[PDB]
Amino acid sequence: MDPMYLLVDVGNTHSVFSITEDGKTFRRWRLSTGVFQTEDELFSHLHPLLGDAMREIKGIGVASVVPTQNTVIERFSQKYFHISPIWVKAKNGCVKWNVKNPSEVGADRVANVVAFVKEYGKNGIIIDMGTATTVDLVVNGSYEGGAILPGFFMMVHSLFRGTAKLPLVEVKPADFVVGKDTEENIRLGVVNGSVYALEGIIGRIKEVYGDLPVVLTGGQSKIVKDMIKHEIFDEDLTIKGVYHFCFG
Amino acid sequence: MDPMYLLVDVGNTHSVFSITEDGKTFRRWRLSTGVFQTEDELFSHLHPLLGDAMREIKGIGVASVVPTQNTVIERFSQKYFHISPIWVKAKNGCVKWNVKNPSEVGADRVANVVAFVKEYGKNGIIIDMGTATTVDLVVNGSYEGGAILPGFFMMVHSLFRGTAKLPLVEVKPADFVVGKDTEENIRLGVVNGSVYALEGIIGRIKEVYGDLPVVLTGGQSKIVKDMIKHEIFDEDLTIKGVYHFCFG
Ligand SMILES: Nc1ncnc2c1ncn2[C@@H]1O[C@H](COP(=O)(O)OP(=O)(O)O)[C@@H](O)[C@H]1O
Ligand SMILES: Nc1ncnc2c1ncn2[C@@H]1O[C@H](COP(=O)(O)OP(=O)(O)O)[C@@H](O)[C@H]1O
Ligand SMILES: CC(C)(CO)[C@@H](O)C(=O)NCCC(=O)O
Ligand SMILES: CC(C)(CO)[C@@H](O)C(=O)NCCC(=O)O
Numbered sequence: 001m002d003p004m005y006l007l008v009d010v011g012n013t014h015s016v017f018s019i020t021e022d023g024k025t026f027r028r029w030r031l032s033t034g035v036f037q038t039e040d041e042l043f044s045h046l047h048p049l050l051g052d053a054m055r056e057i058k059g060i061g062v063a064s065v066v067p068t069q070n071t072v073i074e075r076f077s078q079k080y081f082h083i084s085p086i087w088v089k090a091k092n093g094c095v096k097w098n099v100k101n102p103s104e105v106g107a108d109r110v111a112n113v114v115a116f117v118k119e120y121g122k123n124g125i126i127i128d129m130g131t132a133t134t135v136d137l138v139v140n141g142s143y144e145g146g147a148i149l150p151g152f153f154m155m156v157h158s159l160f161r162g163t164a165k166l167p168l169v170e171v172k173p174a175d176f177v178v179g180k181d182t183e184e185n186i187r188l189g190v191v192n193g194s195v196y197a198l199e200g201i202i203g204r205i206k207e208v209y210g211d212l213p214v215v216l217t218g219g220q221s222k223i224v225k226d227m228i229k230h231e232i233f234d235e236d237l238t239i240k241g242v243y244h245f246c247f248g
Numbered sequence: 249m250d251p252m253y254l255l256v257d258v259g260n261t262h263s264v265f266s267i268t269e270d271g272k273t274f275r276r277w278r279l280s281t282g283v284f285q286t287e288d289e290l291f292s293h294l295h296p297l298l299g300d301a302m303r304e305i306k307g308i309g310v311a312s313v314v315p316t317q318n319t320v321i322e323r324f325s326q327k328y329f330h331i332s333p334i335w336v337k338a339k340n341g342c343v344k345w346n347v348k349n350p351s352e353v354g355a356d357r358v359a360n361v362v363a364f365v366k367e368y369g370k371n372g373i374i375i376d377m378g379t380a381t382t383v384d385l386v387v388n389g390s391y392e393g394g395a396i397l398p399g400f401f402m403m404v405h406s407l408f409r410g411t412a413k414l415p416l417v418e419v420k421p422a423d424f425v426v427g428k429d430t431e432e433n434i435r436l437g438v439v440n441g442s443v444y445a446l447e448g449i450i451g452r453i454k455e456v457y458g459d460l461p462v463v464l465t466g467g468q469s470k471i472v473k474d475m476i477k478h479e480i481f482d483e484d485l486t487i488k489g490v491y492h493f494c495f496g
Binding site for chain 2: 101
C-alpha cells in the first residue's frame, strides 16, 4: 500500500509539518514553534489543516533543533497515534561523519545531508537559509563540516535591538551599490552582504575540494535565489531527509 | 598655547574619551556606555583616569549614536566645566552629504568622513567595525552613502540568543576551510563571512567609482586587519573627526 507518513522539521522559530505516501511528493504546512505549546494545542492547530489525512498517519519522523520541544512531539505522537516518533540524528551508514563530534550537528543538517546523498549524489555544498544560515559540505559521501551564520531576519533584528537609532528593516535585497538612507544601508549590509559571505565561503571550499554542485534550501532562500549560483533549488530537502532517515 | 580638548565618541556598547592638546596626538580611555549613568558617575569614572589633566580641558566635542546619553554628557560638561559640548552632526561646508536625509546618518560616521576628508583625501572607503559594522563612501569630498551590518559580537550573540542549541562563541578568525565543530562553524560564518561580505560590497563599489583607498577603524578591526585589503589603518579616525569638526 502507500501508507501516510508525517514528517516534522522543528526549527527555532517555525516547525514544518509534511505528509507523504511515496516519499517523493509532499503536502506541507508551517506553524510557529511556540515555547509553551502542548500536544493538544498542536493537534488543535493541525486538525483543520490535515483534515481527513490526520487518521491515515502510520509513521512519525522528526528532525528537531529545539530539545525542549521534543517531549511535546513525543506526547502528540503517543496520545493521538499511539506511536513513538523516529528522531533524526547523525549515525553511521550511508553518510560518513568526518567531524569532531557528530552527535552535536543539528538534526536539520543531518537530514539535509542524508537527503542530498540519497537524491543528488556523493559530492555537494548545501546552503540552508532559516533562522540561522547553514553551509554543509559533503565529499565522497563524507560530511566534512561547514559554517554557521545568522539568518537575514536574525541580523536585521540584532541591529534593531542592539542599537539606539536603527529601525527594524524588512528583508529585501539591495539593487544599488551604496545605500542612500538607513534602511537601504542595512538591506545592502545584511542581505547583499550575507550573499557575499556565503559565496566567499563557497569559493574557498571549491579551491580545496574542487567544483561541486550547490543546493539551496530554507524558508529564506526564495528572496535571494538568483543572487547565489546554485545547481539545485530544493525547498523540500530537510523533509526529504527526515523521510529517508526514518522511512527509507 | 595648546589648549586641551576632551573628545567623546558615544557608542551603543562603549564610550571613548580622549584628550589632545594639538589634534595630532591623543590620550584615550574607554568606558561602558551605561543606560542609567549620571554626570557625577561619569566624573567619578574619569577622575582617576584623567588625573590633573581634567582641570585643563577647555572644550568638549561629542559624536553620539545614543540620544538618551546626550542629556548626561551635556550635564557633565556644564556641571564640571561650565561649558556646553559641541555636537557632531552632518552640516554643509567641507563635506557634501549626498544622501536622502543627512540628519539621520550616525554622528560617528559623520566624524569618520570629516576625519578622512580633512586628513587623508577626497576619495575613499571607510570601514568602521564596532557594535555594528559600517561602510562609508566618499567621492570628490562628497558623502555617497554606505552599508550597515551587524558587528562580530552582535552576530555571535544573536546566534547564541536566537537558537536553542548554539553557544556564545569567542570572536576569532577561522584558519580552516570548513569548521569541524559548532564553535568553528560559527567562527567561519561570522568572522570570515563578515570579511567576505565587506570585500564584496567594497569590490562592487570599486567597480562603479574606481580603486578607492580603503580605511580600517573601530575597536573590532584589529583582529581582522590582515584579512581585509586596506591602505589605511586608523583606530583614532572617529576621535580625529570629533576634533576637526568641533575644534578645527
Ligand atoms: N520576531 C520575528 N518577527 C517576525 N518574523 C519573524 C521573527 N522571527 C523570525 N521571523 C520569520 O521567520 C522566518 C525564519 O524562520 P524559518 O525560515 O522557518 O527557519 P527555521 O525553520 O529554522 O525556524 C523568517 O522568514 C522571518 O521573517
Ligand atoms: N553582552 C556582552 N558581553 C560581553 N561583551 C560585549 C557584550 N556586548 C558587547 N560586548 C563587546 O563590545 C564590543 C562592541 O563595542 P565597540 O567595538 O566599542 O563599539 P561601540 O563603540 O559601537 O560601542 C563587542 O565586540 C563585544 O566584545
Ligand atoms: C545551526 C542551526 C541552529 C540551524 O537551525 C542548527 O543546525 C543547530 O542547532 N545546530 C547545532 C549545531 C551544529 O550544527 O553544529
Ligand atoms: C550604525 C551605527 C549604529 C554605527 O555605530 C550608527 O552610526 C547609527 O546609529 N547610525 C544611524 C543610521 C545611519 O547612519 O544611517
